[PDB]
C-alpha cells in the first residue's frame, strides 16, 4: 500500500546540479515527515535533513546545507531534492524515508534509492 | 555526535543475539528516538524500531528494542537465515539524526 517511488539513476557531469525525486502513494502525504538520506561505499549512513511536507518547513545537518534545497509538490504528492555543484564526494545511492513524527517515531517506509554517478 | 555499532556479528539460526548503538556525547536515552534501520541485499531498507522500542507493523515479534545500560540495542530472539543483513541505528541529538556505521550480522547456515 505504503510506497516510494525513486527513479533508479543519474548520470550527470562534475559541478552540474540534479534534482532527485520522491514519489509518496498510499497514505496521505502531508502527515508523514520525509527525510534524504545518502549512502556511500562502506561509509554508513549521512542523514541530510527532512521536510515537513505540510508546511514546507525544513532542517539539515548542517554540512549539506549550501548543497541541498528540499521542496515538495503537494498536489502530486513528490518530494524533491536539488543538489548543486556536484563533485566525485556527491556519488551515492539518495534515499527518501517516511518518518512517523505523529505516531511511533521510526523511519517505516524507504523509498529503493536513486544511484546518482558524477563522472566525466 | 558519533554513534558507534558493533562492526560485524556471527550467529547461528536459533540463537539470540544482541546489537548495540553507543553514544560519543554520553547515555543514550529516551529522548534519542533510538531507530533499528536493516539493509538487505540490493540496497533494500526496512524500519524496524522506532522511539527505542516501537516495532514497526509486520516485523516479527523475535526484534525487541530496549536501553541496555549506556547504549540503544535490538534483540533477535532465534535468530533466522533471513535476519542476516546490515542493522543501523540512528539517534535523534535536538535538531538532526546521526547513523551509526551499521553492523553486519552474519547468521552461518
Ligand atoms: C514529537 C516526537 N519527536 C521526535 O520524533 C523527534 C523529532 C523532533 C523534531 I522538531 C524533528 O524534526 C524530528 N525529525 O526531523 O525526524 C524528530
Known amino acids: 500500500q505504503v510506497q516510494l517511488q525513486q527513479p533508479g539513476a543519474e548520470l550527470v557531469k562534475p559541478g552540474a546540479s540534479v534534482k532527485l525525486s520522491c514519489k509518496a502513494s498510499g497514505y496521505t502525504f502531508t502527515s508523514y515527515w520525509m527525510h534524504w538520506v545518502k549512502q556511500r561505499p562502506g561509509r554508513g549512513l549521512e542523514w541530510i535533513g527532512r521536510?515537513?511536507?505540510?508546511?514546507?518547513?525544513?532542517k539539515y545537518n548542517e554540512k549539506f546545507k549550501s548543497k541541498a534545497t528540499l521542496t515538495v509538490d503537494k498536489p502530486s504528492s513528490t518530494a524533491y531534492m536539488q543538489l548543486s555543484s556536484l563533485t566525485s564526494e556527491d556519488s551515492a545511492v539518495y534515499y527518501c524515508?517516511?518518518?512517523?513524527?505523529?505516531?511511533?517515531?521510526?523511519?517505516?517506509?524507504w523509498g529503493q534509492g536513486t544511484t546518482v554517478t558524477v563522472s566525466s | 555526535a558519533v554513534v558507534t555499532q558493533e562492526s560485524a556479528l556471527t550467529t547461528s539460526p536459533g540463537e539470540t543475539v544482541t546489537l548495540t548503538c553507543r553514544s560519543s556525547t554520553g547515555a543514550v536515552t529516551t529522548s534519542n528516538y533510538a531507530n533499528w534501520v536493516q539493509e538487505k541485499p540490493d540496497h533494500l531498507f526496512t524500519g524496524l524500531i522506532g522511539?527505542?522500542?516501537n516495532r514497526a507493523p509486520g516485523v516479527p515479534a523475535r526484534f525487541s528494542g530496549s536501553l541496555i545500560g549506556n547504549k540503544a540495542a535490538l534483540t533477535i530472539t532465534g535468530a533466522q537465515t533471513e535476519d542476516e543483513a546490515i542493522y543501523f541505528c540512528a539517534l535523534w541529538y535536538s535538531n538532526h539524526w546521526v547513523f551509526g556505521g551499521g553492523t553486519k550480522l552474519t547468521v552461518l547456515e
Open positions: 524515508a517516511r518518518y512517523d513524527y505523529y505516531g511511533s517515531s521510526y523511519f517505516d517506509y
Open positions: 522511539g527505542t522500542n
Open positions: 521536510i515537513d511536507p505540510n508546511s514546507g518547513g525544513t
